Amino acid sequence: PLSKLVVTGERHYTTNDDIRQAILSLGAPGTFMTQDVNIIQQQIERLPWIQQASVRKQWPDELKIHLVEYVPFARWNDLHMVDEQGRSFSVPSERVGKQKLPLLYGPEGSEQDVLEGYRAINKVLAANKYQLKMVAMSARHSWQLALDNDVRLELGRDDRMGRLQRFIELYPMLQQPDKRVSYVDLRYETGAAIGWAPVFI
Asked whether the beta carbons of 103 and 135 are under 8 A apart, the reply is yes
Q: How was this structure determined?
A: X-ray
d(CA 99, CA 110): 24
Asked whether the beta carbons of 148 and 133 are under 8 A apart, the reply is yes
For the domain 1-70, what is the CATH superfamily, name and number? membrane protein fhac (3.10.20.310)
Query: CB under 8 Å to 152, separation ≥6 — which residues?
Result: 144, 145, 146, 182, 183, 184, 195
- At how many degrees (to 10) do helices 36-43 and 16-23 cross? 120
d(CA 154, CA 193): 10
Question: What letter represents residue 104's amino acid?
Answer: L
Asked whether the beta carbons of 51 and 69 are under 8 A apart, the reply is yes
3-class SS of residue 191: coil
Element (H, E) at 89: strand 88-89
The DSSP call for residue 74 is B
Sign of the alpha-carbon dihedral angle for 37, 38, 41, 44 = negative
Provide the 10 A C-beta neighbour count for residue 44: 20
- Expressed in Å, this structure's resolution amounts to 3.4
CA distances from residue 159 to 102, 147, 167 in whole angstroms, order as listed: 23, 20, 13
Domain ranges (residues) in the chain: 1-70, 71-201
- At how many degrees (to 10) do helices 161-169 and 111-127 cross? 20
Q: What share of the chain is helix, strand, coil (3-state, %, to 5)?
A: 20, 25, 55
**For the purposes of burial, counting CB atoms within 10 Å of the CB of 117, is it exposed (0-12), middle (13-18) or buried (19 or more)?**
buried
Q: Which residues pair with 63 in a beta bridge?
A: 5, 57
Element (H, E) at 156: strand 154-156
Specify the CATH number of the domain 71-201.
3.40.50.11690
3-class SS of residue 112: helix
Distance from CA of residue 70 to its chain's centroid?
10
Element (H, E) at 114: helix 111-127
Asked whether the beta carbons of 63 and 3 are under 8 A apart, the reply is yes
